[PDB]
Amino acid sequence: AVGIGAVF
Amino acid sequence: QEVLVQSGAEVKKPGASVKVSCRAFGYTFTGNALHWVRQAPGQGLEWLGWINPHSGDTTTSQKFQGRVYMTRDKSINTAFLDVTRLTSDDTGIYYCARDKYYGNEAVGMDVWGQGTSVTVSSASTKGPSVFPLAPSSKSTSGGTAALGCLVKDYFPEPVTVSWNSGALTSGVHTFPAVLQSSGLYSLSSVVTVPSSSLGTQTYICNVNHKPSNTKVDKKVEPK
Amino acid sequence: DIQLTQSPSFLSASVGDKVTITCRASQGVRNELAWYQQKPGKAPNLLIYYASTLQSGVPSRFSATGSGTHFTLTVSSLQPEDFATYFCQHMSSYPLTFGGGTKVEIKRTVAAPSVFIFPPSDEQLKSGTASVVCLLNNFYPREAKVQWKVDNALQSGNSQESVTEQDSKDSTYSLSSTLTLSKADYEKHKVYACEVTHQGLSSPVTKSFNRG
């Protein structure tokens, strides 16, 4: 699936 | 506890820009990607793009690239959507929606804001003209009569309509507004009542329009 | 883009029924598919993700299947709160897209509309326009035809309809049709009529008045 990078 | 609260309804003229906000409560704002999705009246759902609130990175649907802009302010747990170069096609309800974001990828939109209505028009704010829909003199003996109010040519939405200051609710149908070819809205509110009540019971429709600060009380009687 | 096609667009069912709705994708989306419920005036709610996994708090009567291009959502026994619109959504590639929705409505016994016609008020006429309103009240099923006739001439392009959401209590619909004319055009004719066709009627119904 699409992804927009690491989060916190 | 986990909720998104969005800013209030807006009207803008064509060519202008609108900025809507979405604030996260009850979870860590920077822990989930956030989507913006819009819904035109009577239509389905259209994805605008999404933002990573931690990094600020965005991906915009290419249909909207360079026109729609997503930003965030982490300190206030808030995401912003700027929709620019507006046209009437941009009228609709705009939602922010959190992704579950399992595996740092899109999974599903599990928390939605309440939505922000955006109306794009060159129309001027106007309170409605309220006209009676008078009960038929041919109304059925011992039967049921219909009467109502035509609430015409107002902008923007909404109006509120009550009957007899709220004392009459049963049998009322207040129809969804339609956008007329003129660019102003119109609706009717109707009610069915015993024919025996005509002339004996007074019927008044109360029509309020907050954008124009107007309140109208129209008595509806046999002509 | 990938197109999601939902079927049926409109599903009629009874409380207690088992129903299955379908979502087809124009290209393979693996399992990367979600389902939502939406009610009038409200934001969607997530039901299903990874094509078959129930979201926390969603009732067990909801289930879903599929991979690739074919997906279904099933309600094992419909409850009144389940009559709503359902959407599927894929996330396999950009842009994210949604299906067109499946609206699930309640079946009830056929009910013919009660029909009323309202002439324009004298107050409105003073301002230069005339609105004529035809009301169809409390009918089922939703399909209805309203035709305007002015001096026995069929009208086109000058009317607008509005329909209510299915009533939460009695499961009927109501409909308004509004014919709009300039004052000049209005007084240039006598007989104003709306003709209503609905399957609950033994015969089509005409309600009319003569101007004046």
PDB file of N, CA, C and O in Angstrom, chain C residues 7-50:
ATOM      1  N   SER C   7     -21.871  -2.635  -6.605  1.00  0.00           N
ATOM      2  CA  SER C   7     -23.181  -3.104  -7.030  1.00  0.00           C
ATOM      3  C   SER C   7     -23.891  -3.810  -5.890  1.00  0.00           C
ATOM      4  O   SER C   7     -23.272  -4.489  -5.077  1.00  0.00           O
ATOM      5  N   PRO C   8     -25.210  -3.629  -5.801  1.00  0.00           N
ATOM      6  CA  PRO C   8     -26.003  -2.699  -6.607  1.00  0.00           C
ATOM      7  C   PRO C   8     -25.796  -1.268  -6.137  1.00  0.00           C
ATOM      8  O   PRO C   8     -25.234  -1.071  -5.068  1.00  0.00           O
ATOM      9  N   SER C   9     -26.232  -0.291  -6.912  1.00  0.00           N
ATOM     10  CA  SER C   9     -26.159   1.089  -6.435  1.00  0.00           C
ATOM     11  C   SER C   9     -27.212   1.324  -5.357  1.00  0.00           C
ATOM     12  O   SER C   9     -26.994   2.101  -4.420  1.00  0.00           O
ATOM     13  N   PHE C  10     -28.345   0.634  -5.480  1.00  0.00           N
ATOM     14  CA  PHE C  10     -29.451   0.761  -4.536  1.00  0.00           C
ATOM     15  C   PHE C  10     -30.019  -0.608  -4.198  1.00  0.00           C
ATOM     16  O   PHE C  10     -30.483  -1.316  -5.082  1.00  0.00           O
ATOM     17  N   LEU C  11     -29.951  -0.979  -2.926  1.00  0.00           N
ATOM     18  CA  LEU C  11     -30.376  -2.302  -2.486  1.00  0.00           C
ATOM     19  C   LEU C  11     -31.575  -2.150  -1.568  1.00  0.00           C
ATOM     20  O   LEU C  11     -31.512  -1.419  -0.590  1.00  0.00           O
ATOM     21  N   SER C  12     -32.672  -2.826  -1.895  1.00  0.00           N
ATOM     22  CA  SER C  12     -33.852  -2.833  -1.038  1.00  0.00           C
ATOM     23  C   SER C  12     -33.879  -4.133  -0.258  1.00  0.00           C
ATOM     24  O   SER C  12     -33.719  -5.217  -0.832  1.00  0.00           O
ATOM     25  N   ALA C  13     -34.075  -4.035   1.048  1.00  0.00           N
ATOM     26  CA  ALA C  13     -34.103  -5.227   1.882  1.00  0.00           C
ATOM     27  C   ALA C  13     -34.960  -5.030   3.117  1.00  0.00           C
ATOM     28  O   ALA C  13     -35.305  -3.914   3.477  1.00  0.00           O
ATOM     29  N   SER C  14     -35.305  -6.135   3.764  1.00  0.00           N
ATOM     30  CA  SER C  14     -36.098  -6.101   4.985  1.00  0.00           C
ATOM     31  C   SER C  14     -35.211  -6.271   6.200  1.00  0.00           C
ATOM     32  O   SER C  14     -34.159  -6.898   6.115  1.00  0.00           O
ATOM     33  N   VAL C  15     -35.606  -5.677   7.325  1.00  0.00           N
ATOM     34  CA  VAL C  15     -34.946  -5.966   8.594  1.00  0.00           C
ATOM     35  C   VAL C  15     -34.882  -7.480   8.824  1.00  0.00           C
ATOM     36  O   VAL C  15     -35.872  -8.202   8.648  1.00  0.00           O
ATOM     37  N   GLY C  16     -33.697  -7.963   9.177  1.00  0.00           N
ATOM     38  CA  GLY C  16     -33.497  -9.372   9.406  1.00  0.00           C
ATOM     39  C   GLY C  16     -32.882 -10.097   8.226  1.00  0.00           C
ATOM     40  O   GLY C  16     -32.412 -11.220   8.379  1.00  0.00           O
ATOM     41  N   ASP C  17     -32.893  -9.471   7.047  1.00  0.00           N
ATOM     42  CA  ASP C  17     -32.348 -10.099   5.842  1.00  0.00           C
ATOM     43  C   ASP C  17     -30.831 -10.200   5.891  1.00  0.00           C
ATOM     44  O   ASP C  17     -30.169  -9.332   6.451  1.00  0.00           O
ATOM     45  N   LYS C  18     -30.295 -11.247   5.276  1.00  0.00           N
ATOM     46  CA  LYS C  18     -28.870 -11.328   4.958  1.00  0.00           C
ATOM     47  C   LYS C  18     -28.653 -10.712   3.586  1.00  0.00           C
ATOM     48  O   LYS C  18     -29.326 -11.082   2.620  1.00  0.00           O
ATOM     49  N   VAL C  19     -27.725  -9.762   3.488  1.00  0.00           N
ATOM     50  CA  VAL C  19     -27.418  -9.152   2.203  1.00  0.00           C
ATOM     51  C   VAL C  19     -25.914  -9.057   1.993  1.00  0.00           C
ATOM     52  O   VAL C  19     -25.137  -8.923   2.950  1.00  0.00           O
ATOM     53  N   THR C  20     -25.522  -9.116   0.732  1.00  0.00           N
ATOM     54  CA  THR C  20     -24.131  -9.018   0.320  1.00  0.00           C
ATOM     55  C   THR C  20     -24.021  -7.970  -0.774  1.00  0.00           C
ATOM     56  O   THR C  20     -24.777  -8.018  -1.755  1.00  0.00           O
ATOM     57  N   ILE C  21     -23.088  -7.031  -0.613  1.00  0.00           N
ATOM     58  CA  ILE C  21     -22.837  -6.005  -1.618  1.00  0.00           C
ATOM     59  C   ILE C  21     -21.431  -6.191  -2.190  1.00  0.00           C
ATOM     60  O   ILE C  21     -20.562  -6.757  -1.535  1.00  0.00           O
ATOM     61  N   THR C  22     -21.228  -5.747  -3.427  1.00  0.00           N
ATOM     62  CA  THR C  22     -20.030  -6.082  -4.198  1.00  0.00           C
ATOM     63  C   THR C  22     -19.245  -4.836  -4.591  1.00  0.00           C
ATOM     64  O   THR C  22     -19.825  -3.788  -4.874  1.00  0.00           O
ATOM     65  N   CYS C  23     -17.921  -4.952  -4.557  1.00  0.00           N
ATOM     66  CA  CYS C  23     -17.012  -3.919  -5.012  1.00  0.00           C
ATOM     67  C   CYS C  23     -16.018  -4.568  -5.971  1.00  0.00           C
ATOM     68  O   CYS C  23     -15.373  -5.560  -5.621  1.00  0.00           O
ATOM     69  N   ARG C  24     -15.949  -4.056  -7.196  1.00  0.00           N
ATOM     70  CA  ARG C  24     -14.997  -4.567  -8.172  1.00  0.00           C
ATOM     71  C   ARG C  24     -13.991  -3.491  -8.527  1.00  0.00           C
ATOM     72  O   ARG C  24     -14.360  -2.333  -8.742  1.00  0.00           O
ATOM     73  N   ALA C  25     -12.719  -3.877  -8.579  1.00  0.00           N
ATOM     74  CA  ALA C  25     -11.638  -2.968  -8.936  1.00  0.00           C
ATOM     75  C   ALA C  25     -11.178  -3.186 -10.374  1.00  0.00           C
ATOM     76  O   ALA C  25     -11.110  -4.315 -10.832  1.00  0.00           O
ATOM     77  N   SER C  26     -10.845  -2.105 -11.064  1.00  0.00           N
ATOM     78  CA  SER C  26     -10.414  -2.195 -12.463  1.00  0.00           C
ATOM     79  C   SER C  26      -9.020  -2.819 -12.636  1.00  0.00           C
ATOM     80  O   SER C  26      -8.678  -3.270 -13.726  1.00  0.00           O
ATOM     81  N   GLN C  27      -8.217  -2.798 -11.575  1.00  0.00           N
ATOM     82  CA  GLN C  27      -6.924  -3.473 -11.513  1.00  0.00           C
ATOM     83  C   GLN C  27      -6.810  -4.152 -10.159  1.00  0.00           C
ATOM     84  O   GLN C  27      -7.573  -3.827  -9.250  1.00  0.00           O
ATOM     85  N   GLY C  28      -5.870  -5.081 -10.014  1.00  0.00           N
ATOM     86  CA  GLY C  28      -5.673  -5.773  -8.752  1.00  0.00           C
ATOM     87  C   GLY C  28      -5.185  -4.851  -7.647  1.00  0.00           C
ATOM     88  O   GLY C  28      -4.258  -4.059  -7.846  1.00  0.00           O
ATOM     89  N   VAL C  29      -5.906  -4.856  -6.529  1.00  0.00           N
ATOM     90  CA  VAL C  29      -5.516  -4.101  -5.328  1.00  0.00           C
ATOM     91  C   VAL C  29      -5.076  -4.958  -4.138  1.00  0.00           C
ATOM     92  O   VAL C  29      -5.091  -4.476  -2.993  1.00  0.00           O
ATOM     93  N   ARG C  30      -4.814  -6.242  -4.372  1.00  0.00           N
ATOM     94  CA  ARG C  30      -4.427  -7.163  -3.307  1.00  0.00           C
ATOM     95  C   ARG C  30      -5.532  -7.171  -2.257  1.00  0.00           C
ATOM     96  O   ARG C  30      -6.705  -7.318  -2.595  1.00  0.00           O
ATOM     97  N   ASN C  31      -5.157  -7.062  -0.993  1.00  0.00           N
ATOM     98  CA  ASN C  31      -6.128  -6.931   0.094  1.00  0.00           C
ATOM     99  C   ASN C  31      -6.268  -5.485   0.570  1.00  0.00           C
ATOM    100  O   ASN C  31      -6.751  -5.253   1.698  1.00  0.00           O
ATOM    101  N   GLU C  32      -5.780  -4.519  -0.213  1.00  0.00           N
ATOM    102  CA  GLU C  32      -5.626  -3.186   0.353  1.00  0.00           C
ATOM    103  C   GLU C  32      -6.884  -2.396   0.036  1.00  0.00           C
ATOM    104  O   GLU C  32      -6.906  -1.429  -0.745  1.00  0.00           O
ATOM    105  N   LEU C  33      -7.883  -2.701   0.851  1.00  0.00           N
ATOM    106  CA  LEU C  33      -9.244  -2.309   0.580  1.00  0.00           C
ATOM    107  C   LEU C  33      -9.964  -2.153   1.891  1.00  0.00           C
ATOM    108  O   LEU C  33      -9.876  -3.026   2.763  1.00  0.00           O
ATOM    109  N   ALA C  34     -10.734  -1.079   2.002  1.00  0.00           N
ATOM    110  CA  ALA C  34     -11.496  -0.802   3.203  1.00  0.00           C
ATOM    111  C   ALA C  34     -12.961  -0.581   2.866  1.00  0.00           C
ATOM    112  O   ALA C  34     -13.294  -0.213   1.733  1.00  0.00           O
ATOM    113  N   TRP C  35     -13.833  -0.830   3.841  1.00  0.00           N
ATOM    114  CA  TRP C  35     -15.256  -0.513   3.709  1.00  0.00           C
ATOM    115  C   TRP C  35     -15.695   0.473   4.772  1.00  0.00           C
ATOM    116  O   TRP C  35     -15.231   0.408   5.917  1.00  0.00           O
ATOM    117  N   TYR C  36     -16.612   1.357   4.379  1.00  0.00           N
ATOM    118  CA  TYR C  36     -17.191   2.390   5.240  1.00  0.00           C
ATOM    119  C   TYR C  36     -18.702   2.398   5.179  1.00  0.00           C
ATOM    120  O   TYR C  36     -19.299   2.013   4.169  1.00  0.00           O
ATOM    121  N   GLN C  37     -19.303   2.856   6.270  1.00  0.00           N
ATOM    122  CA  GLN C  37     -20.723   3.160   6.345  1.00  0.00           C
ATOM    123  C   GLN C  37     -20.890   4.664   6.464  1.00  0.00           C
ATOM    124  O   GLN C  37     -20.150   5.296   7.220  1.00  0.00           O
ATOM    125  N   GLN C  38     -21.850   5.238   5.739  1.00  0.00           N
ATOM    126  CA  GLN C  38     -22.166   6.658   5.918  1.00  0.00           C
ATOM    127  C   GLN C  38     -23.660   6.881   5.991  1.00  0.00           C
ATOM    128  O   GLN C  38     -24.418   6.329   5.198  1.00  0.00           O
ATOM    129  N   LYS C  39     -24.064   7.709   6.946  1.00  0.00           N
ATOM    130  CA  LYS C  39     -25.456   8.093   7.119  1.00  0.00           C
ATOM    131  C   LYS C  39     -25.630   9.569   6.781  1.00  0.00           C
ATOM    132  O   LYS C  39     -24.660  10.325   6.817  1.00  0.00           O
ATOM    133  N   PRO C  40     -26.848   9.973   6.386  1.00  0.00           N
ATOM    134  CA  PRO C  40     -27.048  11.360   5.963  1.00  0.00           C
ATOM    135  C   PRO C  40     -26.593  12.352   7.026  1.00  0.00           C
ATOM    136  O   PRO C  40     -26.926  12.205   8.199  1.00  0.00           O
ATOM    137  N   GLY C  41     -25.811  13.337   6.611  1.00  0.00           N
ATOM    138  CA  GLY C  41     -25.363  14.373   7.519  1.00  0.00           C
ATOM    139  C   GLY C  41     -24.165  14.009   8.371  1.00  0.00           C
ATOM    140  O   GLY C  41     -23.717  14.820   9.183  1.00  0.00           O
ATOM    141  N   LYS C  42     -23.635  12.799   8.197  1.00  0.00           N
ATOM    142  CA  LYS C  42     -22.528  12.343   9.031  1.00  0.00           C
ATOM    143  C   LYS C  42     -21.316  11.954   8.212  1.00  0.00           C
ATOM    144  O   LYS C  42     -21.428  11.652   7.028  1.00  0.00           O
ATOM    145  N   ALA C  43     -20.148  11.990   8.848  1.00  0.00           N
ATOM    146  CA  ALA C  43     -18.933  11.475   8.236  1.00  0.00           C
ATOM    147  C   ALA C  43     -19.002   9.955   8.139  1.00  0.00           C
ATOM    148  O   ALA C  43     -19.708   9.315   8.922  1.00  0.00           O
ATOM    149  N   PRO C  44     -18.280   9.370   7.175  1.00  0.00           N
ATOM    150  CA  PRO C  44     -18.188   7.907   7.129  1.00  0.00           C
ATOM    151  C   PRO C  44     -17.567   7.308   8.392  1.00  0.00           C
ATOM    152  O   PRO C  44     -16.816   7.978   9.110  1.00  0.00           O
ATOM    153  N   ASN C  45     -17.897   6.044   8.647  1.00  0.00           N
ATOM    154  CA  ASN C  45     -17.293   5.253   9.716  1.00  0.00           C
ATOM    155  C   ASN C  45     -16.641   4.031   9.111  1.00  0.00           C
ATOM    156  O   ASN C  45     -17.248   3.364   8.265  1.00  0.00           O
ATOM    157  N   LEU C  46     -15.426   3.717   9.548  1.00  0.00           N
ATOM    158  CA  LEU C  46     -14.710   2.531   9.072  1.00  0.00           C
ATOM    159  C   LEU C  46     -15.279   1.235   9.632  1.00  0.00           C
ATOM    160  O   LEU C  46     -15.450   1.092  10.840  1.00  0.00           O
ATOM    161  N   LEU C  47     -15.568   0.299   8.728  1.00  0.00           N
ATOM    162  CA  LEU C  47     -16.085  -1.035   9.061  1.00  0.00           C
ATOM    163  C   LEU C  47     -15.013  -2.109   9.002  1.00  0.00           C
ATOM    164  O   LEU C  47     -14.908  -2.967   9.893  1.00  0.00           O
ATOM    165  N   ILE C  48     -14.329  -2.131   7.859  1.00  0.00           N
ATOM    166  CA  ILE C  48     -13.433  -3.211   7.445  1.00  0.00           C
ATOM    167  C   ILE C  48     -12.141  -2.657   6.882  1.00  0.00           C
ATOM    168  O   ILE C  48     -12.174  -1.679   6.147  1.00  0.00           O
ATOM    169  N   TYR C  49     -11.000  -3.263   7.210  1.00  0.00           N
ATOM    170  CA  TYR C  49      -9.738  -2.924   6.547  1.00  0.00           C
ATOM    171  C   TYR C  49      -9.009  -4.230   6.219  1.00  0.00           C
ATOM    172  O   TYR C  49      -9.415  -5.302   6.691  1.00  0.00           O
ATOM    173  N   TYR C  50      -7.974  -4.143   5.381  1.00  0.00           N
ATOM    174  CA  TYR C  50      -7.284  -5.344   4.868  1.00  0.00           C
ATOM    175  C   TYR C  50      -8.280  -6.326   4.239  1.00  0.00           C
ATOM    176  O   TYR C  50      -8.122  -7.550   4.329  1.00  0.00           O
TER     177      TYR C  50
END
